[PDB]
Amino acid sequence: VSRTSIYYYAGSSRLLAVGNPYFSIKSPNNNKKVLVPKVSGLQYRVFRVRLP
Amino acid sequence: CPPLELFNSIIEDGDMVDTGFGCMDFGTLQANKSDVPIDICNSTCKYPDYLK
């Protein structure tokens, strides 16, 4: 692999993430209908970023 | 449960920093007026937004 002399920037502007800190709740109607998602301060935040 | 929204404004003096209880407006989002000390209960606390 040969290094060239070109560089670039990537912009990934602010993310929204709110919900219940304890568990997740779902609908009484179905069982796959999420209502507010479980998000805590202990969750494994893993990102999957594409590249052009 | 009321939905949460990200507001942003200008800091003026007399207003307080966060005290570990969430950067939010305690006056309109609480009703009991009995969850925080009396210093911040009728006001809102702010915090910087360094990346913005």
From Swiss-Prot, chain A:
Subcellular location: Virion; Host nucleus
Superkingdom: Viruses
Biological function: Forms an icosahedral capsid with a T=7 symmetry and a 50 nm diameter. The capsid is composed of 72 pentamers linked to each other by disulfide bonds and associated with L2 proteins. Binds to heparan sulfate proteoglycans on cell surface of basal layer keratinocytes to provide initial virion attachment. This binding mediates a conformational change in the virus capsid that facilitates efficient infection. The virion enters the host cell via endocytosis. During virus trafficking, L1 protein dissociates from the viral DNA and the genomic DNA is released to the host nucleus.
Subunit and partners: Self-assembles into homopentamers. The capsid has an icosahedral symmetry and consists of 72 capsomers, with each capsomer being a pentamer of L1. Interacts with the minor capsid protein L2; this interaction is necessary for viral genome encapsidation. Interacts with protein E2; this interaction enhances E2-dependent replication and transcription activation.
Family from the record: Belongs to the papillomaviridae L1 protein family.
Record protein name field: Major capsid protein L1
UniProt organism field: Human papillomavirus 58
Whole sequence portion shown: 54 to 105 of 524
